[PDB]
Amino acid sequence: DAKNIKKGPAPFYPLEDGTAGEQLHKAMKRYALVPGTIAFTDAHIEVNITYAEYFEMSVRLAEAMKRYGLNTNHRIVVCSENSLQFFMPVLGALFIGVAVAPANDIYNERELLNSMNISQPTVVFVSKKGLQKILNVQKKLPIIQKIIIMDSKTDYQGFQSMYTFVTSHLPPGFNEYDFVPESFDRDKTIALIMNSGLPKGVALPHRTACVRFSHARDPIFGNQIIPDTAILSVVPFHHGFGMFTTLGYLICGFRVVLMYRFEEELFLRSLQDYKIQSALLVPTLFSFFAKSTLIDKYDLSNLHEIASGGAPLSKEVGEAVAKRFHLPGIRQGYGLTETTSAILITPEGDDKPGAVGKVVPFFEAKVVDLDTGKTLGVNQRGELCVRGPMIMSGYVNNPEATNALIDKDGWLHSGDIAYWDEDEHFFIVDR
């Protein structure tokens, strides 16, 4: 110390001001003004929704929730499998500083109850197939006073859709392109309450999404903003890996192709036909594609990268997948729910097998001795600790669990074993 604290380089672009709502609003308004720019594509049903459509419905949902009465003292739950509609109430609530709690749509009723007992939402957005579970949770959590169906146009089984709800509360003359997103304190207004014994609520201020948005547009730590870039994401939107890659893709103006049910031929054909440049996989899908022999039958010449993951993958698995996809390697990244997003990212092209990446801008990371907490040195194995502005502000009504994890020095103890090498690539040791 000082040379055993690994530091992230400066951001290519300075850190934008304003809330996460404001930066999303600003970027998506610009993309909305180009007709036909695609935001999301559902691979199963083949429908595209454009930035204009997405911007206007999100702005309308923002103003409708504001006029309903929701403010920074309220939370919503968005409970739905990955869908064209998922990010509409997410964006609307961020535009007005209402915290959003994504609800694992393959939670059973009990997992659902505990998730929402922590987040205490006033309004629930849910897909049709989640409705009866929400209703049963409402019997035990009557703070849920309003339930809105996401994947309907008309009312559904007595409940308003997002479209009928918006119509009920927009003022006459509402103009989507005059709407101004709320300004408020970036550090103290919670953007997301993510789920991590029993899961905890992880409160993430807007600031931490604003920092992710720096990483997402970064030419080294994210993606170059280039027109007609398309992503294939098969990662759940309600978990932090899918939440904050997708928001970053929206701020980049990318086309986000989604699948909520993995199928081998549909995935490969979607890579081919949508000329996908980046594909996102959960760890166990890497093992799957290590076994796949169909990859050669598809034109994947546009494929530039495959990114992971919660994980970390084995070095052997990542090398086998990379070979099959005729790529030089896998672009890994590492983070926890409590760090918002990845705080260790494989730099563009700076690719190394088994490595999880380097420290991201605004962060620092070290490896401490498992017995003493002392800062270790190159290739020394110990506990990974990270410090930076994407760390959560704490667990929700659980300051004891918060303090076990983050000291007064603001260092986050990942509970993972790690080491960094000569060129400062981090590796995670599997326990």
Ligand X SMILES: Oc1csc(-c2nc3ccc(NC4=CC=C4)cc3s2)n1
Binding site residues, ligand X, CB under 6 A: 240-241, 245, 307, 310, 331, 333-337, 341-342, 345-346
Half-sphere exposure (CA, 13 Å, Cβ side) for 304? 12
Integer CA distances (angstroms), 159 to 6, 73, 147, 164, in order: 52, 24, 7, 9
What is the smallest separation between the CB atom of 133 and ligand X, expressed in angstroms? 24
Toward ligand X, which CB reaches closer, 7 or 304?
Answer: 304
Toward ligand X, which CB reaches closer, 268 or 342?
Answer: 342
Beta strands (DSSP E) in 293-411 are: 305-308, 331-335, 342-345, 358-359, 364-368, 382-387, 394-395
What is the smallest separation between the CB atom of 333 and ligand X, expressed in angstroms? 2
What is the smallest separation between the CB atom of 344 and ligand X, expressed in angstroms? 8
Contacts of 22 (CB under 8 A, 6+ apart): 181, 183
Toward ligand X, which CB reaches closer, 102 or 333?
Answer: 333
3-state secondary structure of 291: helix
Contacts of 54 (CB under 8 A, 6+ apart): 28, 32, 39, 40, 87, 88, 91, 250
Toward ligand X, which CB reaches closer, 199 or 310?
Answer: 310
Toward ligand X, which CB reaches closer, 131 or 311?
Answer: 311
What is the smallest separation between the CB atom of 187 and ligand X, expressed in angstroms? 20
Integer CA distances (angstroms), 409 to 211, 303, 385, 403, in order: 20, 42, 11, 11
What is the smallest separation between the CB atom of 334 and ligand X, expressed in angstroms? 6
Q: Which amino acid, one-letter code, is at 17?
A: D
Toward ligand X, which CB reaches closer, 80 or 195?
Answer: 195
Q: For residue 426, what are the β-bridge partners?
A: 357, 420
Token duo for residue 390: 């994407």
Q: For residue 77, what are the β-bridge partners?
A: 101, 124
* Spatial distance between the Cα atoms of 330 and 308, rounded to a whole number of angstroms: 8
What is the smallest separation between the CB atom of 241 and ligand X, expressed in angstroms? 4
Look up tokens 């304190």; give the residue. Answer: 185
